[PDB]
């Protein structure tokens, strides 16, 4: 089947930010045209990559793609927020040992200082500036509801929490 790829990979963006959904599978059938499915409705884009420009609140929701095959792609979900700090994350469900990058991101390239990540309530790591937590070998205990506290323009802001859960790759 054609799986759906995200550039940048992050399914949680800010209002107004861009993202481009690309969708590809094994080339058993030659690539001619693609179908897009915002919420269930067919989008007016044929191209294999759809560029979601300037996010609005209505740009939220279930996304899906399709080719001339007999069967469809998975229901990737894209929530869109306007707020001060969004604790972005690579994937919402991962299997151990895949790369996981986390990023406590601030509105319009703004720089968040005194950044602290929380995993399930406890302080996982703190750094002076914003950082890219990166765990390449996710453990099954890594599953938690995460959130990050930061300081943007001298004021304190907590991101909305986001739960992530790992699974065992055998079975």
């Amino acid at each position: 089947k054609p799986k759906v790829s995200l550039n940048p990979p992050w399914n949680r963006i800010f209002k107004g930010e861009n993202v481009t959904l690309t969708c590809n599978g094994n080339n058993f059938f030659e690539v001619s045209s693609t179908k897009w499915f915002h919420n269930g409705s067919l989008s007016e884009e044929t191209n294999s990559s759809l560029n979601i420009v300037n996010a609005k609140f209505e740009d939220s929701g279930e996304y899906k793609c399709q080719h001339q095959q007999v069967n469809e792609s998975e229901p990737v979900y894209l929530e869109v927020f306007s707020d001060w700090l969004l604790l972005q994350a690579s994937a919402e469900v991962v299997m151990e040992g895949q790369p996981l990058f986390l990023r406590c991101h601030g509105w319009r390239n703004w720089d968040v200082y005194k950044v602290i990540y929380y995993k399930d309530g406890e302080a996982l790591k703190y750094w002076y500036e914003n950082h890219n937590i990166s765990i390449t070998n996710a453990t099954v205990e890594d599953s938690g509801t995460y959130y990050c506290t930061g300081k943007v323009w001298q004021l304190d802001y907590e991101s909305e929490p986001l739960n992530i859960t790992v699974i065992k790759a055998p079975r």
């Binding site: 306007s82 323009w153 001298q154 004021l155």
Partner: protein, 426 residues
């Protein structure tokens, strides 16, 4: 629209443009910012003759206010004669009189200028243990001059600074030196050099320097004061938004009630500060019964450069109630304090925390600035307390030695006020 009192300002032609041989001159007064019509203007010319003529008013488009100009034309010894304009607005009050007294010419002098220099930190980037601020008032026409230093706007004692004036030729030069600890300088406080010269004010500002100064908008929302709620009976709430970056455009500021019932019209002031920000204040009148019965009011702040809307809300405290205890005291007489005394008041065991404290003397409630009042703090048991301190002078207690400390508080009975008198001599 509410009744508004006019602001009266002079209007004289500028004397470099006035010919010296002109035997006659026209001056005037602008009365602007009042509701409703009319005002009456009279002119006292001293001893000269004069012709008074008042124009029809102009309705200001932006605010709907009225602006009228009343002119006087005089002849004779015009340049040396005092001139007074007296404006009465009987809608404001029957005895409302604005008296503005001035001359045709306030004369021409060279502008003084002000600049502030500072100690340099050393070759390693470290501050010295004390910081010198040197306020320099460059060449001005010799005259009486005063320099005041302010720390975040509050006057410091003159003992902590020096001042020096020299004269070279026909021009004076003034310098003032202020000494500060390194600790105060590193705390990012802002210091103002205030120059008073011939009844005109100049100023300059400084704070600890910086390679960069990020700042963001913050917002605060007050409750009505008990004094305004129960004595004045005209409660208001204020949404104050500070430290916004003066970008392009006006900041969107909206009042709403959780019930969906209508809000009154609010007033809005925007003011640039010494420290580089723009502070916006919005004041909303609230209903007295509305507030007392538990309504919740919301201030919503939006701006295109903001990430999200900023929201603040305010409502009557849901805690229990308890009446204030009041105690007033005078300090004893001792050496060095013969003609100035200090009075004190303790207000305690009240609940909830919002309270207004004033001092009354001889059938006038003295201005709030005369005294100081601490912030409410928790008692060990149940309720809050505050202290108030009032320095008084000999003429006041010789006028009347009874000084009343009064607290206004929602739980006080029977009329939401409690007061106690003290006499210093007994």
């Amino acid at each position: 629209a509410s009744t508004q009192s006019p602001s009266v300002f002079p209007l004289t032609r500028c004397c470099k443009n006035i010919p010296s041989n002109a035997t006659s001159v026209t001056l005037g007064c602008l009365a602007t910012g009042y509701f409703p019509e009319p005002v009456m203007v009279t002119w006292d010319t001293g001893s000269l003759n004069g012709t008074t003529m008042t124009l029809p008013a102009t309705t200001l488009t932006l605010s709907g206010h009225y602006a009228t100009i009343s002119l006087l034309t005089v002849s004779g010894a015009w340049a040396k004669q005092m001139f007074t304009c007296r404006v009465a607005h009987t809608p404001s009050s029957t005895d409302w009189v604005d008296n503005k007294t001035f001359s045709v010419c306030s004369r021409d002098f060279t502008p003084p200028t002000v600049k502030i220099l500072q100690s340099s930190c050393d070759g390693g980037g470290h501050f010295p243990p004390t910081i010198q601020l040197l306020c320099l008032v460059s060449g001005y026409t010799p005259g009486t001059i005063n320099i005041t230093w302010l720390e975040d706007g509050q006057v410091m004692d003159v003992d902590l600074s020096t001042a020096s004036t020299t004269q070279e030729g026909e021009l004076a030069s003034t310098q003032s030196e202020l000494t500060l600890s390194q600790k105060h300088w590193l705390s990012d406080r802002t210091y103002t050099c205030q120059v008073t010269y011939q009844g005109h004010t100049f100023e300059d500002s400084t704070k600890k320097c910086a390679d960069s100064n990020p700042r963001g908008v913050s917002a605060y929302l007050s409750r009505p004061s008990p004094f305004d709620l129960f004595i004045r009976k005209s409660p208001t709430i204020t949404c104050l938004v500070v430290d916004l970056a003066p970008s392009k455009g006006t900041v969107n500021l909206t009042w709403s009630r959780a019930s969906g019932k209508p809000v009154n019209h609010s007033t809005r002031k925007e003011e640039k500060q010494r420290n580089g920000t723009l502070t916006v204040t919005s004041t909303l009148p609230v209903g007295t019964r509305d507030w007392i019965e538990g309504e919740t009011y919301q201030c919503r702040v939006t701006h295109p450069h903001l990430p999200r809307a900023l929201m603040r809300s305010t409502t009557k405290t849901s805690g229990p109630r308890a009446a204030p205890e009041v105690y007033a005291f005078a300090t004893p007489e001792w050496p060095g304090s013969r003609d100035k005394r200090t009075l004190a008041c303790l207000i305690q065991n009240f609940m909830p925390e919002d309270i207004s404290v004033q001092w009354l003397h001889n059938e006038v409630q003295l201005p709030d600035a005369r005294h100081s009042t601490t912030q409410p703090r928790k008692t060990k048991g149940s309720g809050f307390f505050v202290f108030s301190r009032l320095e008084v002078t000999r003429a006041e207690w010789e006028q009347k030695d009874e000084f009343i400390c009064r607290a206004v508080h929602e739980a006080a009975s029977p009329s939401q006020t409690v007061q106690r008198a003290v006499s210093s001599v007994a």
